[PDB]
Design a protein around this ligand. Sequence first.
Ligand SMILES: Oc1c(I)cc(Cl)c2cccnc12
Ligand SMILES: Oc1c(I)cc(Cl)c2cccnc12
Ligand SMILES: [Fe+2]
Ligand SMILES: [Fe+2]
Lengths: 332, 332
Amino acid sequence: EPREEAGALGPAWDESQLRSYSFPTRPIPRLSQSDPRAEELIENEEPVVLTDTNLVYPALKWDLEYLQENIGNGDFSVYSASTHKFLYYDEKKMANFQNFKPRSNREEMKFHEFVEKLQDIQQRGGEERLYLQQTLNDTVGRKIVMDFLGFNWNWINKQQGKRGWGQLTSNLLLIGMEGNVTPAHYDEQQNFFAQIKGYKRCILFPPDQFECLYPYPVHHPCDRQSQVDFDNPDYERFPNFQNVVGYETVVGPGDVLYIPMYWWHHIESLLNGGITITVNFWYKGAPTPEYPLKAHQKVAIMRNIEKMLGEALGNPQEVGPLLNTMIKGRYN
Amino acid sequence: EPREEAGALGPAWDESQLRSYSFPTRPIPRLSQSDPRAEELIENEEPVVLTDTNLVYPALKWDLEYLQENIGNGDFSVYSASTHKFLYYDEKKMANFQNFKPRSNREEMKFHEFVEKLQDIQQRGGEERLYLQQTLNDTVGRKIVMDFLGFNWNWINKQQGKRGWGQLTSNLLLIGMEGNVTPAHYDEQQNFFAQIKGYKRCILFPPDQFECLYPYPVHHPCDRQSQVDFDNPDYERFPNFQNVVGYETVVGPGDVLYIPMYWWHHIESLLNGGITITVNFWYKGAPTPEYPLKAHQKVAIMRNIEKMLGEALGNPQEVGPLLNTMIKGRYN
Ligand SMILES: Oc1c(I)cc(Cl)c2cccnc12
Ligand SMILES: Oc1c(I)cc(Cl)c2cccnc12
Ligand SMILES: [Fe+2]
Ligand SMILES: [Fe+2]
């Protein structure tokens, strides 16, 4: 059931704001940071919404206005698509596949310019949507640095210690528009996903559902994304999508979602629900210490064979025919 | 056309002694050792029958009687099958596959005992056939050592030098019974196949016909053999067998066949043609020095991925499902 906001301000969100999908899902547990079960889920690399970290307390005041006034005149990466689906591609790998035009084009700008194109689009009721994805570096204004400084570093660094994780690799900041979807993909890093403004539906799939999810080829610029269009699944090409079962939740201002290493996540900003703000924190996982082997290690292996083959053969286009030659009438 | 033996002794063999097969084949060139074209085929790793090496001149006198009188009382590996097809299995790998009973059972013995079971079988018109495959070591009698000593070492060692090949790894000696088939398989070593007594039909396939030949899984005890039963090919399981094209020849006393590294060979002793004797010499190929990649190197690669996977997963039975997970809806 949708959560009731304090002081009776009404339901935070309602069902009609969520897209409809072919697969069932179960709920991710919402817990307190002090709960022993949350700690148990994290070490066990299972998802968990932590409702009371205060991780990004100072950022909760943030709207566009405030950020405009304070982030300063630096350069911000802005992605742009004529549709609700924001398929991230990888630029390095574009060389690997020629018959692939990007359907979502990046563009650098200043915050006011991003806010410009934002207010405009809404004022002219357009279908174009936008995402601001910017790895928070240095150019940022004094107040925002003060906001940053006030994040709950005690809590997060102590999680990094207990999990024996490696180093904080990045802090993306995300500002998007209502209805924005980030299609299913997995990451190699442990992730804390800190919600700030707006509501996001997060659907997660364990790594053992590799077979139902059909990642793009490793050398493909969409490496790590599902090939399956969730809005129109192709059961002829992707029969095992019919078997997919997700874990689902809705995060709002103050919630931190642990997205474990190698879990798929598909993320959507609520329809008619306004802009969204998230900040995420990524940590390199603990290093390798044993059988039975875990699903994610098997995924590591498939990736590695694929990388190796592309090297040995001098050509990523040849990986697929070599793999078929290897299994046809032999392993299949 | 079948070759005419000197002094008009009649056709060496006739068509009716050859089994009938679903695939076409072309002839391997019969050449002289002095011919520049033979040297050109060898360095190019293509097959060639050399008609005048004198490689095993002293052994041409050998029949059963002579060998009995001279090889001495040592131990000789003898394979035994209730059929014409001698499927060699690998003993180490038997652990890897349980639902596999060997259909051709080995047995050690003395030469007279082998000759015993030979004369008997013929006298009692039986379907059981036998092969003597013995890596010539030391136990052998003085005359046979003298025979050995007289082989054309000048010629063979000078081939090893020119080809930059590594070391002579083995000298099998083969004595079999008429109609014996050795089903298609490939070897990793360069091979000189020296015919001595009887006639053998050798059908060879280049390594680029991997796809039509369907080798068993690398961890299978029949690793390196075709899965295809040439006498009853299963075009449902092995569709690309329909595309197979071989190079064929008939070798007799005095002929040496170069079987290049990684070429498939399927070998059959002529029907109604009596016992056969061969001695083969195997050399480790030249070491690796470049694209485009050669078929055999690609075969090296498929083998390696397969070996790696079996290691990483701690279980050869899991190689196949991991490979399918890796290609299904991804590369196929
Ligand atoms: O890597 C990510 C980006 I970039 C943007 C979003 Cl919305 C994500 C959401 C969940 C997990 N990872 C995400
Ligand atoms: O490895 C071999 C054995 I053991 C027995 C036979 Cl009649 C062969 C014939 C051709 C090539 N290799 C062969
Ligand atoms: Fe992600
Ligand atoms: Fe062989």
